[PDB]
């Protein structure tokens, strides 16, 4: 990781800032009296500054995360309780199992999923929800638009002795493998709202959708879109800033 240092505040260097992101900066940081631009690789900039060639506390303090009936474990953990173990290798791919949204979806799966149900996990990442679905007797497809998480999802699956299907893409790619009994989607409010009509098309008549990744204040958008798509509200769950909204068609 590289850093390009510039004297002054962020507001003071305002006009030249878009040029720093044109170079390929990943983030700016105002400090004592400087602005710290961060680059993957150093490239010459005529702004005149100084280049410098300069998570594990979280990872080594990482404890098992309870999401009844599950416990989310790193490969280096064990568990003596009665909970269903979910072994997830912590990485850069979302789905470590610790976040509120992931845990809300895990619990919602336990309440809604029937053994034999066809389950679509939209935005599978690490594969945690598709794996959990399989653990509950579901027949899971996990899809992701990022092909890089897919090897990680398959590796996680083998750690758990289950075999969901994993696939690159989104709702479109999932279509030939559906229709589904249950959709689980840990995304974000505005995407749920845009996808609501296609959520209905993805499910069998009487099927259901479990939607999370939704900031509390953004929930009205999802409620409005899902009602507009013809869904009926089933239940809502919350933890901290976040909510899960369950719907039936």
């Amino acid at each position: 990781m590289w850093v390009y240092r510039l004297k002054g505040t962020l507001e003071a260097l305002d006009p030249i800032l878009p040029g720093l992101f044109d170079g390929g900066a990943r983030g700016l940081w105002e400090r004592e009296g400087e602005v710290w631009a961060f680059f993957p690789a150093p490239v010459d900039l005529p702004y005149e500054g100084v280049w410098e060639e300069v998570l594990e506390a979280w990872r080594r303090d990482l404890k098992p995360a309870l999401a009844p009936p599950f416990v989310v474990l790193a490969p280096w953990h064990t568990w003596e309780g009665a909970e269903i173990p979910l072994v997830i290798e912590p990485g850069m791919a979302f789905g470590t199992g610790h976040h509120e949204t992931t845990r809300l979806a895990l619990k919602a799966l336990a309440r809604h999923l029937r053994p034999g149900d066809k389950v679509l996990d939209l935005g599978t990442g690490s594969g945690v929800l598709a794996i959990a679905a399989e653990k509950l007797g579901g027949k899971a497809l996990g899809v992701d638009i990022d092909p890089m998480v897919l090897p990680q999802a398959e590796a996680n699956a083998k750690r758990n002795g289950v075999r969901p299907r994993f696939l690159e893409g989104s709702l479109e790619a999932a279509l030939p493998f559906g229709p589904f009994d249950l959709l689980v989607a840990n995304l974000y409010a505005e995407l749920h709202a845009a996808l609501a009509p296609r959520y209905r098309e993805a499910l069998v008549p009487g099927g259901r959708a479990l939607l999370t990744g939704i900031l509390k204040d953004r929930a009205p958008l999802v409620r409005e879109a899902m009602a507009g798509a013809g869904f009926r509200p089933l239940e809502e769950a919350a933890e901290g800033e976040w909510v899960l909204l369950a719907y039936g068609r």
Binding site: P15, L17, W29, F38, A57, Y188, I214
Partner: protein, 118 residues
Amino acid sequence: MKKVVAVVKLQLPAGKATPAPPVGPALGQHGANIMEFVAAFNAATANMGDAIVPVEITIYADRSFTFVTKTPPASYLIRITWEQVLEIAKQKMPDLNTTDLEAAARMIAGSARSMGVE
């Protein structure tokens, strides 16, 4: 309250923040939950697409945090001077320090000229 121990000013791409620098060290030095911020920032700025988002993270003595996202900057909103500041002046209300709804366009259009935009 909740004692404030830091006010961190960052500028991040919308919905694509990571635990990598500056977020890592910026919040990590005060013991704030990096992964919690990353997840929350990304969801809060998700619909904005590729917009550069300035963010202010207030970190407290119990290691918890809150944050505020910005308008964002005019230099991004500038990138041929048309009727730009008929809505940009109303966009720069919660960013500029001037305590007037109207007296803003008389400074944004001038700042746009040197970029250089004609």
